[PDB]
Amino acid sequence: KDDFAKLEEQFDAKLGIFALDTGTNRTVTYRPDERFAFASTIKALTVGVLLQQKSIEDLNQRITYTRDDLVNYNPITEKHVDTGMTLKELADASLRYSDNTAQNLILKQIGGPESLKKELRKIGDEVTNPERFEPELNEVNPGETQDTSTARALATSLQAFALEDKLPSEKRELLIDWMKRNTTGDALIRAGVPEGWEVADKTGAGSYGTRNDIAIIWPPKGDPVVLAVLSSRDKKDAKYDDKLIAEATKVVVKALN
Ligand SMILES: O=C(O)CC(=O)CCO
């Protein structure tokens, strides 16, 4: 725990860590129950719920939308206004590019932030508190619980969908495969794990320099480790440093070693 404290000093940030080795039940925790804006990490759990509700052929359904529907960060969706996108294509864009419009379109499909909350409550997550769409959800002020969760809750809900029986295996594999092919976390959890370790992650960035990564990680042999690494800073306009998360992950790996 002192190693984490020193990272908090080095990077002038608050750190939230929960890691579980599913083979041994050993954990690594640090402010595990402290709330942080979840930011785009919520995209992973939103797709988990979508997969609970949609069949695979349901995902071939084309969703149409307009220039008006576009928000601030639409790397994929802004390129397909004219033709629309399938739910499967939207899930891809949301998870692997962190496309905000894609998240919003998927979120509508599942009944909005309240339905997402109800669904998370049903799987035993009493902490995660979705209220808004992207990008407004990313802006959480100190003391607020709206659009927040904790390291422990995020890791546990991700584990529920990716590793447990909340999804049947083919849908688990689908979620895992998208997250394995995430494009946005090269400097985060992925930069903190030894060679030959496999990573399936979703990143997030929000106000107060919030910088998150949640993941399932697989050692060369043995069971997966579930990990959430969350962070925030004291100023609203603060910039984050990805190295904080990479270094935190290294501590986690060492501790489980
Ligand atoms: O991490 C996120 O989900 C937000 C992004 O802008 C992608 C890279 O930061």
Q: What is the CATH number of the domain that holds 196?
A: 3.40.710.10
Distance, in Å, from the CA atom of 121 to the CA atom of 138, rounded to the nearest integer, reads: 21
* Closest ligand 1 atom, residue 40 Cα: 3
The token duo for 30 is 């640090």
Q: Please state, as a whole number, how many other Cβ atoms lie within 10 Å of the Cβ of residue 93.
A: 25
Distance, in Å, from the CA atom of 143 to the CA atom of 184, rounded to the nearest integer, reads: 28
Specify the resolution in Å.
2.0
Distance, in Å, from the CA atom of 248 to the CA atom of 16, rounded to the nearest integer, reads: 10
Q: Find residue 72's DSSP bridge partners.
A: none
* Of 202, 255, 250, 197, nearest in space to 41 by CA: 202
* Of 63, 68, 51, nearest in space to 173 by CA: 51
Looking at the structure of the chain, the number of domains it has is: 1
DSSP state letter for 135: T
Protein residue whose Cα sits closest to atom 3 of ligand 1:
204
* Of 154, 156, 49, 192, nearest in space to 112 by CA: 49
* Closest ligand 1 atom, residue 97 Cα: 7
Pocket of ligand 1 (CB under 6 A): 40, 73, 98, 184, 203-205
Give catalytic residue positions. Answer: 40, 136
* Of 133, 124, 152, 126, nearest in space to 46 by CA: 133
Q: Find residue 225's DSSP bridge partners.
A: 21, 217
* Separation of CA 99 and ligand 1 centre (Å): 9
Distance, in Å, from the CA atom of 74 to the CA atom of 89, rounded to the nearest integer, reads: 13
* Closest ligand 1 atom, residue 184 Cα: 8
* Separation of CA 235 and ligand 1 centre (Å): 19
Kind of pairing, strands 35-37 and 148-150? antiparallel
* Separation of CA 5 and ligand 1 centre (Å): 25
Distance, in Å, from the CA atom of 199 to the CA atom of 180, rounded to the nearest integer, reads: 6
From 74, 184, 211, 244, the mutation candidate for ligand 1 (largest count of ligand atoms within 8 A of CB) is 184
* Separation of CA 23 and ligand 1 centre (Å): 31
The token duo for 165 is 């029986």
* Of 64, 53, 37, nearest in space to 111 by CA: 53
3-state SS, residue 211:
strand
* Domain membership of residue 143 as a residue range: 1-257
From 42, 77, 98, the mutation candidate for ligand 1 (largest count of ligand atoms within 8 A of CB) is 98
